[PDB]
Design an enzyme around this catalytic site. Structure first.
Site, PDB file in Angstrom:
ATOM      1  N   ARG A 265      -6.192   8.542   2.248  1.00 29.68           N
ATOM      2  CA  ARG A 265      -5.441   8.718   3.488  1.00 29.68           C
ATOM      3  C   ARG A 265      -4.281   9.707   3.392  1.00 29.68           C
ATOM      4  O   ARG A 265      -4.171  10.616   4.223  1.00 29.68           O
ATOM      5  CB  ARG A 265      -5.023   7.372   4.103  1.00 29.68           C
TER       6      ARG A 265
ATOM      7  N   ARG B  20     -13.211  -5.887   9.679  1.00 32.25           N
ATOM      8  CA  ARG B  20     -13.519  -4.792   8.767  1.00 32.25           C
ATOM      9  C   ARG B  20     -15.001  -4.691   8.439  1.00 32.25           C
ATOM     10  O   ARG B  20     -15.414  -3.696   7.830  1.00 32.25           O
ATOM     11  CB  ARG B  20     -12.718  -4.938   7.469  1.00 32.25           C
TER      12      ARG B  20
ATOM     13  N   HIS C  15      -2.403  -4.732   2.233  1.00 31.56           N
ATOM     14  CA  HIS C  15      -3.721  -4.520   2.838  1.00 31.56           C
ATOM     15  C   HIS C  15      -3.695  -4.233   4.342  1.00 31.56           C
ATOM     16  O   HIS C  15      -4.582  -3.536   4.844  1.00 31.56           O
ATOM     17  CB  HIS C  15      -4.625  -5.704   2.489  1.00 31.56           C
TER      18      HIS C  15
ATOM     19  N   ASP D 195       0.818  -1.211   0.000  1.00 28.27           N
ATOM     20  CA  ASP D 195       0.000   0.000   0.000  1.00 28.27           C
ATOM     21  C   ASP D 195       0.850   1.258   0.000  1.00 28.27           C
ATOM     22  O   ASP D 195       1.858   1.352   0.716  1.00 28.27           O
ATOM     23  CB  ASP D 195      -0.846   0.054   1.267  1.00 28.27           C
TER      24      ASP D 195
ATOM     25  N   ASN E  21      -8.561  -2.561  -2.330  1.00 25.19           N
ATOM     26  CA  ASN E  21      -9.920  -2.251  -1.921  1.00 25.19           C
ATOM     27  C   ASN E  21     -10.200  -0.754  -1.917  1.00 25.19           C
ATOM     28  O   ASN E  21     -11.370  -0.367  -1.928  1.00 25.19           O
ATOM     29  CB  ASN E  21     -10.241  -2.880  -0.560  1.00 25.19           C
ATOM     30  N   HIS E  22      -9.166   0.093  -1.940  1.00 20.49           N
ATOM     31  CA  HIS E  22      -9.380   1.532  -2.062  1.00 20.49           C
ATOM     32  C   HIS E  22      -9.547   1.993  -3.504  1.00 20.49           C
ATOM     33  O   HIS E  22      -9.902   3.154  -3.725  1.00 20.49           O
ATOM     34  CB  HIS E  22      -8.272   2.314  -1.366  1.00 20.49           C
TER      35      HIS E  22
HETATM   36 MN    MN Z   1      -6.417  -2.495   1.469  1.00 25.00          MN
HETATM   37 MN    MN Z   2      -4.537  -0.042   2.617  1.00 28.42          MN
END
Ligand code: MN
Ligand code: MN
Ligand code: CL
Lengths: 293, 7
Positions: free
Chosen positions: A90, A215, A242, A58, A118-119
């Site tokens: 972020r 989550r 992740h 990430d 997933n972002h």
């Molecule tokens: Mn992620």
């Molecule tokens: Mn992430």
């Protein structure tokens, strides 16, 4: 689309005070999105890659840390790269981050690879910062253009038939690699099923089999799910991202799975390094590490 | 802690 001019402007800020923006034109960014989307659709959704290469987890808009990773590992195409997703949200500079990554995909489409995190999903990035950055620095039409591109990203990669790479992890519905290859694009990330789990699931030391994921979506999986998966598919390692890990990388299930997280200083709680994994020609893994500040 | 969707 003047790719070299775009890349040149993005790299110009190397050595500036961390924070200096690179503001491309709206037409330039639209072009990056449209051309990269075409390339993503032209390549398989399950990538078959060759070592040597560098694998990054990430980034979350930490553009100056992305530049450090390239400084340490070699700017494309001096090294081949696979990124595992979560480019945006972020951090302060999601726009520069994704623009440089898309520019390198277009310039070096057979030597530079981006998976979906997933972002890379409008539902998440609406809330987690990328929508706000697009709205402030460009407009919401450009955010939709980004979303259309993200909806075409590949979902997993296998390096030399031995390292299975994805953003999140395994799925209870993943029985054959053909299930991944059969996923049609463009697609959003569903809130359940194979595609969801590949981008959302997590390994857990205290889970036997499949467990509930904190989550609120997907699952956790234990060390024996990993072992059984590697045995069934004749693989040696699962490489995923992740989850924030203090060392930038963290092995799991007797070094059968590795988590990479490449954004140092991500959290207020603990300090974390960012790591990039170097995979040599024989699939031996080493690390280049952005130590915490 | 940024909110567990995830520090
Ligand atoms: Mn992620
Ligand atoms: Mn992430
Ligand atoms: Cl297990």
């Amino acid at each position: 689309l003047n790719l070299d001019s775009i890349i040149g402007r993005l790299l110009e800020v190397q050595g500036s005070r961390p924070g200096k923006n690179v503001q491309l034109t709206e037409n330039e960014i639209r072009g990056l999105c449209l051309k990269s989307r075409e390339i993503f659709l032209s390549q398989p959704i399950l990538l078959e890659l060759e070592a040597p290469l560098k694998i990054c987890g990430d980034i979350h808009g930490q553009y100056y840390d992305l530049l450090r990773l390239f400084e340490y590992g070699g700017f494309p195409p001096e090294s081949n790269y696979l990124f595992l997703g979560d480019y945006v949200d972020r951090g302060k500079q999601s726009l520069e981050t994704i623009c440089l990554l898309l520019a390198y995909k277009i310039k070096y489409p057979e030597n530079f690879f981006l998976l979906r995190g997933n972002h890379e999903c409008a539902s998440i990035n609406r809330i987690a910062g990328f929508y706000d950055e697009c709205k402030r620095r460009y407009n919401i039409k450009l955010w939709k253009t980004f979303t259309d591109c993200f909806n075409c990203l590949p979902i997993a990669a296998i390096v030399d038939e031995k390292i299975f790479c994805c953003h999140g992890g395994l799925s209870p519905d993943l029985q054959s690699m053909e299930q991944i290859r059969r996923i049609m694009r463009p697609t959003d990330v569903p809130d359940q099923g194979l595609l969801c789990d590949l981008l959302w699931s997590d390994p857990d030391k205290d889970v036997q089999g499949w467990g509930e994921n904190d989550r609120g979506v997907s699952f956790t999986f234990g060390a024996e799910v990993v072992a059984k998966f590697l045995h069934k598919h004749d693989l040696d390692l699962i490489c995923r991202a992740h989850q924030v890990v203090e060392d930038g990388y963290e092995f799991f299930a007797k070094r059968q799975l590795v988590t990479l997280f490449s954004a140092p200083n991500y959290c207020g709680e603990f300090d974390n390094a960012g790591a990039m994994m170097s995979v040599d020609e024989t699939l031996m893994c080493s690390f280049q590490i952005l130590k915490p500040a | 802690x940024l909110x567990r969707x995830x520090x």
